[PDB]
Ligand binder design. Structure first.
Ligand SMILES: *[C@@H]1O[C@H](CO)[C@@H](O[C@@H]2O[C@H](CO)[C@@H](O[C@@H]3O[C@H](CO[C@H]4O[C@H](CO)[C@@H](O)[C@H](O)[C@@H]4O)[C@@H](O)[C@H](O[C@H]4O[C@H](CO)[C@@H](O)[C@H](O[C@H]5O[C@H](CO)[C@@H](O)[C@H](O)[C@@H]5O)[C@@H]4O)[C@@H]3O)[C@H](O)[C@H]2NC(C)=O)[C@H](O)[C@H]1NC(C)=O
Ligand SMILES: *[C@@H]1O[C@H](CO)[C@@H](O[C@@H]2O[C@H](CO)[C@@H](O[C@@H]3O[C@H](CO[C@H]4O[C@H](CO)[C@@H](O)[C@H](O)[C@@H]4O)[C@@H](O)[C@H](O[C@H]4O[C@H](CO)[C@@H](O)[C@H](O[C@H]5O[C@H](CO)[C@@H](O)[C@H](O)[C@@H]5O)[C@@H]4O)[C@@H]3O)[C@H](O)[C@H]2NC(C)=O)[C@H](O)[C@H]1NC(C)=O
Ligand SMILES: *[C@@H]1O[C@H](CO)[C@@H](O[C@@H]2O[C@H](CO)[C@@H](O[C@@H]3O[C@H](CO)[C@@H](O)[C@H](O)[C@@H]3O)[C@H](O)[C@H]2NC(C)=O)[C@H](O)[C@H]1NC(C)=O
Ligand SMILES: *[C@@H]1O[C@H](CO)[C@@H](O[C@@H]2O[C@H](CO)[C@@H](O[C@@H]3O[C@H](CO)[C@@H](O)[C@H](O)[C@@H]3O)[C@H](O)[C@H]2NC(C)=O)[C@H](O)[C@H]1NC(C)=O
Ligand SMILES: *[C@@H]1O[C@H](CO)[C@@H](O[C@@H]2O[C@H](CO)[C@@H](O[C@@H]3O[C@H](CO)[C@@H](O)[C@H](O)[C@@H]3O)[C@H](O)[C@H]2NC(C)=O)[C@H](O)[C@H]1NC(C)=O
Ligand SMILES: *[C@@H]1O[C@H](CO)[C@@H](O[C@@H]2O[C@H](CO)[C@@H](O[C@@H]3O[C@H](CO)[C@@H](O)[C@H](O)[C@@H]3O)[C@H](O)[C@H]2NC(C)=O)[C@H](O)[C@H]1NC(C)=O
Ligand SMILES: *[C@@H]1O[C@H](CO)[C@@H](O[C@@H]2O[C@H](CO)[C@@H](O[C@@H]3O[C@H](CO)[C@@H](O)[C@H](O)[C@@H]3O)[C@H](O)[C@H]2NC(C)=O)[C@H](O)[C@H]1NC(C)=O
Ligand SMILES: *[C@@H]1O[C@H](CO)[C@@H](O[C@@H]2O[C@H](CO)[C@@H](O[C@@H]3O[C@H](CO)[C@@H](O)[C@H](O)[C@@H]3O)[C@H](O)[C@H]2NC(C)=O)[C@H](O)[C@H]1NC(C)=O
Ligand SMILES: *[C@@H]1O[C@H](CO)[C@@H](O[C@@H]2O[C@H](CO)[C@@H](O[C@@H]3O[C@H](CO)[C@@H](O)[C@H](O)[C@@H]3O)[C@H](O)[C@H]2NC(C)=O)[C@H](O)[C@H]1NC(C)=O
Ligand SMILES: *[C@@H]1O[C@H](CO)[C@@H](O[C@@H]2O[C@H](CO)[C@@H](O)[C@H](O)[C@H]2NC(C)=O)[C@H](O)[C@H]1NC(C)=O
Ligand SMILES: *[C@@H]1O[C@H](CO)[C@@H](O[C@@H]2O[C@H](CO)[C@@H](O)[C@H](O)[C@H]2NC(C)=O)[C@H](O)[C@H]1NC(C)=O
Ligand SMILES: *[C@@H]1O[C@H](CO)[C@@H](O[C@@H]2O[C@H](CO)[C@@H](O)[C@H](O)[C@H]2NC(C)=O)[C@H](O)[C@H]1NC(C)=O
Ligand SMILES: *[C@@H]1O[C@H](CO)[C@@H](O[C@@H]2O[C@H](CO)[C@@H](O)[C@H](O)[C@H]2NC(C)=O)[C@H](O)[C@H]1NC(C)=O
Ligand SMILES: *[C@@H]1O[C@H](CO)[C@@H](O)[C@H](O)[C@H]1NC(C)=O
Ligand SMILES: *[C@@H]1O[C@H](CO)[C@@H](O)[C@H](O)[C@H]1NC(C)=O
Ligand SMILES: *[C@@H]1O[C@H](CO)[C@@H](O)[C@H](O)[C@H]1NC(C)=O
Ligand SMILES: *[C@@H]1O[C@H](CO)[C@@H](O)[C@H](O)[C@H]1NC(C)=O
Ligand SMILES: *[C@@H]1O[C@H](CO)[C@@H](O)[C@H](O)[C@H]1NC(C)=O
Ligand SMILES: *[C@@H]1O[C@H](CO)[C@@H](O)[C@H](O)[C@H]1NC(C)=O
Ligand SMILES: *[C@@H]1O[C@H](CO)[C@@H](O)[C@H](O)[C@H]1NC(C)=O
Lengths: 444, 102, 125, 125, 444, 125
């Protein structure tokens, strides 16, 4: 009656994990932290096929593309930092005084003028040099100063030519694998997606390294989206995706120099040196009204999970490192750490601009590795910066004695959640082209 | 080396008409002839390279065609931004130059 | 090449069986260089494993191959209409994955092996 | 192995068609180790792409394969003598490369696909 | 009437670029700058098949094999220099005097006896050492000396065991690719070649690094060959290939020592130290008559392109670095820079030995990389050397006011033209084994 | 997969010819990563060289393939019983390895090539 028939090319897939190569246009330059050793050129025709009558189970919280991106970004940081100047002769005693230049009261003590002995191109001669160092980079040797990492880690200067500006990268699957995109606009990243397509590569994802705020990310199409591995678990971060972005205006007003010091036979140390004009605090402005309407939308969407009559409180971070207690980020080449206590300070009952002070740092341990730190060279001129706040990473306060109110604070640190906000709609699947089915046909 | 003759030595033409400048080389030079524009008080600006290709950012009204010994530069419309001296060049040699005029 | 890839994934199995070549053409194309090379090599040997499976049956160089293995109603008792006009290949795979290895074993146990031996012997008379 | 490789490149197409195996045998065999491995892997997947193209037509395991695609005089209006006795394969490729993709599309569009489906159906009666 | 027929194994190819592996016999030794990490053993039977009735377009000036050889040779130099002694403790003040030994008037000031403090195996002890340094390696610290690269680059000693003698390397194509050789004896490297063959690998090409003169290269079969990307363009170098070579006899008459200085726990610095006997200038002899007949042939072939009545003038280089202003080369392990002003000094109207003084150098930046230099250790004894001048790299003077005369000067520096002279006759092609043609046969 | 691998190595050739699929399934699956990748790539291209040899004969997608090459008693003058019932495949390979290349040359010289050309011509009448 019926016989086994073998079909090859059958459209069937399974869940699997694989290594995804990265496509990138990579135009310009004639010096990129990422697309120079790992990724490859883009695709002129990005082809997306809508899989009709297809409902597919997605899970952004068990997506191996996020882990692959984490490993790739860390490794690419390390590779970019490998061929640069090692700053081991700068772990010496530093004689430091306060800056005599005109300094605002807020910036008093933040910057130190430090004189020290350094190596020259000739190993038998020493030079007396001086440099400006931020107070967050400088530890007193006793109750004479020293850099912060000298006790724990060796320091490597970042190559000034290499730029820290994120460029989009598309994650593409090899042959025999596919990337399924969830096209549902209300999708919270877990469960069945009815509107599915297949793509060669993901969209252009900028590897933006930041805490407490998702800058230059994608925007929700319809409404603010609240996503969490377990919304009832306070230990799990809450990813908030905006539908309209909030512009953020960051700047370091100091007109800065870059003094070159020949530390070795061909090695250069780029210190700050001097500031032309007045000295003022670096800061970030956001619109008060825009932030108000965005927080109102976030509260409206949080009340879906936490009840309609509950009071939603926004408070600043409870504690941690400077990376997680502040909106830490990097644009213009310098590393900002901005106090978001003015962003999150509200109580929403169920019924102009904000200026965030920012502190700059030059010694950074980005991924908390042991025995490795980076010196960020100073940038010549005045650095300004404009970005779209497109989301938040929040943490709900646990152990609440009062059941009527819920408190949410900024969070971050683990950047796997920064790119979970981008890779939530993608899923790697594995084509099983061989099928067997009954047909009336019989081999002779 | 390779002598060049560029004609007309001086040209005056009203807006809208076409301007055809001719460069004649002293021997076969394949297609390696370039056309530059020099406004007064400014450096020359390359319009045509390899006698047919158009430099990026140049309006399409500038064009060039030629080979062997004979080359022609054509400006279809004498728009007001274009008043400048035009030069042909083969290798080290620069043409005598022609100045359009309104 | 990529056009129509998996487009019939939600089609019926009968309708998706007319698009097998779009999904068959798409199975063949520093540390990260090693990663890309490992991906390419894995794809190659996977494709070759599938082709070897097809070839140890009578299905070499074929995207649809009729066999001499009878269908057992212990694997699926649906009639052809439910399979080829009401169901998709993903649902069918979910239903039949528990017996797939038995079916493969039967495909290479007796039919192709005894067929080949019998054609060895029929080329004598 | 390498003997006679491309020796009939300047022969007529008819005469060069008797030497296809010398050119078919020759398609299969630190940072520089990665370079050699990339070359070998590329050769392998290229060979497999060509074999897949042959197999999605009826031309699996064949160096000469007759098809059911008619010749269109819009691709070439020469008579067999000009092609197989006066021209070489390089000249023919130069002449026919503009239509090659149309010919490949026709080879896998209807003839092998409808043939296979019709053999699926002829194995019922 | 006619039907599509598919043929596989068709002899058709296209122009393409690929990575070519290198075959080499690699006999001897029980320490090669090239065939130790990159290339592989040779082929007992070099098989060449003549492609009859085949005319193929070649272009030596857009040959990717030349670029591949450039990258390979640079990378192989770097790899050979990686596992050797870093000479960073030798960037110190050097107290230098003139050499008291018997010195000829030509060699006065060329060599300096320099005393300096050096590290020992124990880091807490220093040694007073002295070494002989050529004047071209030594810069005065002020208007006390220093090595030349201390301001700009770090220096690495070349391993003395590793030899700089070129060995032939054959460039072989992978599967699915072929190397077509142009067998025409009048071929200028561009255009159609009627006599074509196919080869598994190129001929044995010695990677000889030199300027202004092609040493140990291939010879033209019939006549002197003048080749240029554009003979009318003075900016393009002219490659001259000889039909008969000119022997060149090079020598450094100094009987030299190699003093070993333990600079580190297991690191050794090999200085010159002392000279046994008289001191004389290094030099290269060529036959005056042979050079005369070769230059006459070169003039005869240049007049084909530049007219029959024109005066061909040979003048020395107009300027540049010591690498390009002199015949720079390396044989015997030491780096020679020879004044070719006596080679090129003539005026040819349309109608004994030459001695070239040579200066030796030990600090070499071969490929003008940034932050990297090499120290060449001295060679014990007297180094002599015999080579075949098999070609020239010339540059024609532009902007000539006088149309009757043409002036040609030595050139070089870009070694991509040194191996363009060897790879001019080869072309990588890409086999397209699948063809479709009409036949009367029809599938059943 | 690995079960029974080479288990019939000491069997007679006739008896070991019924187990060809266990030995056919087993031919397809930092510096040490490069070593493993080189091993995998070598296995792949070796398998493809063997399949190409089978395909340039009429033996594509077949583990037993009858040919049109007569047996020469200069290669072995044993009767079928001594070969298929008294000898093993290892002993046979030791005995016949000196002529293997002649046999391969004859397999691809005339039989498959002239057969293919004759089938090209028989598809005309
Ligand atoms: C979110 O996304 C936003 C949009 O992408 C980002 O904002 C972008 O931030 C980048 C990085 O700071 C900005 O890029 C800079 O833009 C300037 C040049 O662009 C234009 O600027 C002028 C007017 O503003 C205009 O005249 C120019 O012609 C140009 O159009 C410069 O600040 C800067 O250029 C510098 O880029 C090189 C790499 O940084 C640098 O090497 C060069 O300077 C160095 O070298 C030269 C030559 O050797 C020397 O002369 C210099 O002294 C120095 O040594 C060069 O000057 C850079 O390109 C970008 O403009 C900005 N976009 C917008 C729309 O604002 C955010 O940063 C993102 N946010 C986060 C958190 O990632
Ligand atoms: C163009 O092409 C030309 C032909 O190839 C090149 O000329 C060649 O140049 C090379 C390199 O200088 C010459 O090779 C040297 O030849 C000598 C040995 O060969 C013969 O010499 C003796 C007679 O001359 C004879 O008795 C010998 O038995 C032998 O047959 C030596 O100068 C030298 O040998 C040295 O080679 C090792 C690597 O250089 C070296 O390590 C050895 O010495 C070191 O080690 C030993 C043992 O540890 C110690 O005892 C030493 O003190 C020292 O530490 C060894 O001595 C080398 O092989 C070649 O002869 C020459 N050929 C010709 C025909 O002239 C040109 O150079 C090419 N031109 C260019 C520009 O590239
Ligand atoms: C950090 O402190 C250093 C000193 O350690 C400051 O630089 C020094 O400042 C003095 C006083 O301004 C300079 O002296 C002056 O120099 C000018 C010429 O440059 C001369 O005209 C004046 O008469 C006077 O001598 C001195 O040169 C300079 N450098 C040194 C090595 O002493 C530096 O400005 C301080 N930076 C900040 C931001 O406060
Ligand atoms: C973030 O917002 C703050 C607060 O509005 C901005 O500071 C304001 O910046 C303007 C423009 O520079 C200042 O105006 C100028 O001030 C000085 C002192 O009078 C003088 O140079 C000019 O006459 C002019 O008035 C303004 O005073 C200043 N206000 C305050 C309260 O600091 C800041 O620029 C914004 N930063 C961004 C967008 O990066
Ligand atoms: C997704 O599933 C739906 C069913 O839920 C599929 O819809 C079917 O689509 C086909 C092809 O367009 C329709 O056939 C056409 O129907 C009419 C008669 O109804 C006739 O005019 C045409 O001759 C043609 O056959 C079919 O009616 C329709 N059936 C439904 C809605 O029940 C759809 O194809 C699936 N899409 C995929 C897999 O992309
Ligand atoms: C290169 O092209 C030439 C034609 O330009 C080819 O020459 C042809 O070679 C064949 C085979 O040797 C000759 O056939 C022989 O001819 C004579 C009668 O002329 C007869 O004695 C033999 O029975 C045999 O068939 C043929 O005459 C000759 N034709 C010419 C010169 O017109 C040559 O084969 C090509 N070589 C290649 C592709 O290697
Ligand atoms: C470069 O200069 C050094 C000195 O910095 C020269 O070596 C030194 O030369 C002196 C005088 O010849 C040596 O003194 C003599 O030593 C011998 C035994 O070796 C002894 O018999 C004599 O009475 C006299 O004392 C001295 O030892 C030697 N070394 C040092 C460290 O002073 C070197 O020869 C010079 N090189 C050239 C090429 O001119
Ligand atoms: C390059 O050519 C020059 C010039 O012909 C050669 O120099 C000559 O070399 C010979 C052999 O060493 C010298 O003869 C010897 O000279 C001294 C002083 O009289 C003495 O040791 C012996 O009695 C013998 O005569 C000759 O003087 C010398 N001539 C000149 C003008 O320097 C040189 O050797 C050649 N170099 C090569 C082939 O590498
Ligand atoms: C190793 O070699 C021995 C011979 O030296 C093989 O022994 C043979 O094994 C077969 C299969 O078990 C026996 O066949 C059976 O024999 C009896 C009649 O004797 C009958 O009851 C059964 O119908 C069956 O056919 C065969 O007798 C025996 N022959 C001998 C000992 O001469 C053995 O198979 C080899 N083992 C391997 C390759 O694993
Ligand atoms: C942040 O910077 C942007 C520009 O990068 C500012 O946008 C401009 O705002 C001014 C003042 O209202 C307008 O006149 C311009 O038209 C705006 N656009 C541009 C392109 O300049 C924006 O105002 C800044 N936002 C702040 C300080 O809240
Ligand atoms: C900040 O956000 C705005 C709004 O999304 C961005 O402007 C959009 O840019 C996209 C780029 O594909 C365009 O398609 C939209 O039309 C733009 N919208 C508007 C309203 O202009 C803007 O580029 C973002 N800026 C940064 C620095 O990321
Ligand atoms: C360059 O050196 C070669 C040998 O390497 C010399 O050739 C010898 O020359 C002498 C003197 O005329 C002859 O007796 C020998 O027979 C030649 N051959 C050999 C193998 O020694 C050559 O003369 C030198 N050329 C110069 C100095 O111009
Ligand atoms: C210098 O050139 C001569 C002449 O080309 C070389 O001698 C030839 O070497 C080849 C090697 O294959 C032989 O086939 C020729 O017979 C030789 N010719 C003569 C006339 O002897 C010589 O080897 C070259 N020397 C160097 C050092 O490269
Ligand atoms: C220097 O700054 C420190 C804070 O870093 C402050 O305590 C001290 O009083 C200052 N000294 C001065 C202005 O002399
Ligand atoms: C996400 O949506 C699914 C339905 O698609 C729902 O079952 C699940 O509970 C949602 N997750 C959260 C945290 O609300
Ligand atoms: C079908 O499968 C059952 C076990 O599920 C088995 O016992 C039976 O023999 C099989 N039928 C056929 C016809 O092979
Ligand atoms: C041949 O090609 C033309 C277009 O060039 C097309 O219109 C025509 O139908 C084709 N003929 C056949 C028989 O397929
Ligand atoms: C040492 O040599 C220099 C040239 O390098 C010369 O000017 C100086 O006079 C010499 N001194 C002596 C011989 O004392
Ligand atoms: C090289 O030879 C070709 C003909 O083979 C000729 O057309 C071309 O002009 C020649 N090149 C030069 C520079 O003379
Ligand atoms: C068998 O081999 C011999 C050489 O050993 C050869 O001469 C003979 O012709 C061959 N026989 C056949 C039938 O091919």
């Amino acid at each position: 009656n019926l016989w086994v028939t073998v079909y090859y090319g059958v459209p069937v897939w399974k869940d699997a994990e694989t290594t995804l190569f990265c496509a990138s246009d990579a135009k310009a330059y004639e010096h990129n932290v990422w697309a120079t050793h790992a990724c490859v050129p883009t695709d002129p025709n990005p082809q997306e096929i809508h899989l009709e009558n297809v409902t597919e189970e997605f899970n952004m919280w068990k997506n191996n593309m996020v882990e692959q991106m984490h490993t790739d970004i860390i490794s690419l940081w390390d590779q970019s930092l490998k061929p640069c100047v090692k700053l081991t002769p700068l772990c010496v005693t530093l004689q430091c005084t306060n800056v005599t230049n005109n300094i605002t009261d807020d910036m008093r003590g933040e910057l130190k003028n430090c004189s020290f002995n350094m190596t020259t191109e000739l190993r038998d001669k020493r030079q007396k040099v001086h440099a400006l160092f931020y107070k967050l980079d400088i530890v007193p040797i006793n109750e004479s100063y020293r850099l912060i990492n000298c006790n724990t880690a060796a320091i490597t200067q970042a190559c000034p030519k290499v730029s820290f500006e994120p460029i989009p990268i598309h994650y593409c699957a090899p042959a025999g694998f596919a990337i399924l995109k969830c096209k549902d606009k209300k999708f919270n990243g877990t469960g069945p997606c009815p509107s599915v397509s297949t793509v060669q590569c993901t969209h252009g994802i900028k590897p933006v390294v930041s805490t407490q705020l998702l800058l230059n990310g994608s925007l929700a199409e319809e409404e603010v989206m609240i996503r969490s591995k377990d919304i009832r678990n306070n230990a799990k971060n809450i990813l908030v995706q905006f539908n309209t972005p909030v512009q953020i205006n960051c700047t370091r007003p100091n007109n800065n120099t870059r003094k070159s010091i020949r530390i070795g036979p061909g090695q250069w140390f780029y210190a700050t040196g001097d500031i032309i004009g007045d000295i003022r605090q670096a800061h970030c402005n956001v619109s008060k009204a825009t932030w108000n309407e965005t927080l109102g939308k976030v509260v409206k969407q949080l009340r879906k999970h936490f009840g309609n009559n509950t009071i939603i409180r926004f408070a600043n971070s409870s504690g941690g490192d400077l990376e997680v207690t502040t909106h830490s980020f990097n644009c213009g080449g310098e590393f900002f750490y901005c106090d978001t206590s003015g962003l999150f300070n509200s109580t929403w009952i169920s019924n102009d601009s904000i200026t965030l002070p920012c502190r700059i740092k030059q010694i950074i341990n980005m991924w908390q590795r042991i025995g490795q730190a980076m010196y960020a060279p100073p940038i010549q001129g005045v650095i300004r910066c404009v970005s779209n706040i497109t989301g938040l990473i929040l943490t709900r306060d646990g152990g609440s004695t009062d059941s009527t109110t819920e408190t949410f604070r900024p969070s971050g640190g683990d950047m796997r959640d920064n790119w979970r906000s981008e890779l939530y709609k993608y899923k790697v699947v594995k084509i099983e082209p061989l099928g067997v089915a009954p047909t009336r046909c019989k081999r002779r | 080396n390779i002598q060049m003759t560029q004609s007309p030595s001086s040209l005056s033409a009203s807006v809208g008409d076409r301007v055809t400048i001719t460069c004649q080389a002293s021997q076969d030079i394949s297609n390696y002839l370039n056309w530059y524009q020099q406004k007064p008080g400014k450096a020359p600006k390359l319009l045509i390279y390899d006698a047919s290709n158009l430099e990026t950012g140049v309006p399409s009204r500038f064009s060039g065609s030629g080979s062997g010994t004979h080359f022609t530069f054509t400006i279809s419309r004498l728009q007001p931004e274009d008043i400048a001296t035009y030069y042909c060049q083969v290798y080290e040699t620069f043409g005598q130059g022609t100045k359009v005029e309104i | 090449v990529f056009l129509g890839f998996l487009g019939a994934a939600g089609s019926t199995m009968g309708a998706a069986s007319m698009t097998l070549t779009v999904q068959a053409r798409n199975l063949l194309s520093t540390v990260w260089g090693i990663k890309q090379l490992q991906a390419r090599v894995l794809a190659v040997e996977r494709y070759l494993r599938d082709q070897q499976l097809l070839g140890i049956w009578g299905c070499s160089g074929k995207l649809i191959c009729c066999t001499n293995v009878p269908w057992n109603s212990s694997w699926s008792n649906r009639n052809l209409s439910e399979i080829w006009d009401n169901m998709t290949w993903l649902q069918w795979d979910k239903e039949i994955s528990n017996y797939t290895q038995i079916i493969y074993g039967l495909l290479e146990e007796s039919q192709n092996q005894q067929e080949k031996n019998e054609q060895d012997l029929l080329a004598l008379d």
